[PDB]
């Protein structure tokens, strides 16, 4: 009944531009579509909800007001997020042979 816990790990797709273009066209057409304002709540909600369900990653509450234009949305979705433990982060930092790290947790 309870879905498995989702990783925060997100890698920006190469074809992100085309995806965003199509979704903007669907939700809203004008030239310089990057400069389309999201002042209207209905349109903004629709766009962001679609992108969240499709990409599996959502804009946080803190960053919502910052999403003034479509350009800002594009900027946000081209930023990678890595979800891994600190132990994993240290291990995959290309450690020299003399350095050894253990985790007792």
């Amino acid at each position: 009944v309870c879905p498995p816990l989702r990783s925060r790990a997100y890698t920006p797709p190469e074809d992100l531009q085309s995806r965003l273009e199509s979704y903007v066209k669907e939700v809203f057409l004008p030239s310089n579509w990057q400069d389309i304002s999201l002042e209207d709540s209905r349109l903004k909600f629709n766009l962001l909800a679609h992108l969240a369900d499709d990409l599996g990653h959502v804009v946080p509450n803190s960053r919502l007001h910052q999403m003034c234009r479509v350009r800002d949305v594009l900027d946000f979705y081209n930023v990678p997020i890595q979800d891994r433990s600190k132990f994993d982060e240290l291990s995959a930092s290309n450690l020299p042979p003399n350095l050894k790290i253990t985790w007792s947790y």
Binding site: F87, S93, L95, P96, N98, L99, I101, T102, S104, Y105
Partner: protein, 148 residues
């Protein structure tokens, strides 16, 4: 005070810098907490500084334990067999980096009073003074007030 404390002469481990210099520090163990304010600096050290230190000092083996602890510590072991335990509790990254570098520079010799600021195994080249140096010899080796 000196009278209240042990002393030693200035020494090296195995004539360290005579043939080739060998770094005395051998192993360096860090105990760091994942959560805990004491190990904050220590964590940041492990994040940025320890990798570079390890690269700079290949002769030293660095162990990072990452366990629950109220006070984080660094344990330094030397070739002569000395063990030094140093608390990095509530220290900045700069302070820890300083301390760790000091441990690398130090030998395993005890930090007690050093009796003489110099040590030589061949103090004399011309020959150590004795009473008969700067004394003239006499004919037939006659003592004072000796008839024959």
């Amino acid at each position: 005070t000196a009278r209240g404390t042990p002393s030693r002469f200035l020494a090296s481990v195995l004539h360290n810098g005579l043939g080739r210099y060998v770094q005395q520090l051998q192993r360096l163990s860090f105990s760091v907490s994942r959560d805990g304010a004491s190990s904050r600096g220590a964590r940041e050290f492990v994040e940025r500084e320890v990798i570079d230190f390890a690269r700079r000092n290949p002769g030293v083996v660095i162990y990072v334990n990452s366990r629950p602890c109220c006070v984080p510590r660094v344990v330094a072991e030397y070739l002569n067999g000395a063990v030094r335990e140093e608390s990095i509790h509530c220290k900045s990254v700069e302070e820890i980096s300083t301390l760790v570098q000091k441990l690398a520079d130090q030998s395993g010799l005890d930090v007690i009073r050093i009796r003489k600021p110099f040590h030589t195994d061949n103090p004399s080249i011309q020959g150590q003074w004795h009473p008969f140096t700067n004394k003239p010899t006499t004919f037939r080796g006659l003592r004072p007030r000796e008839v024959q």
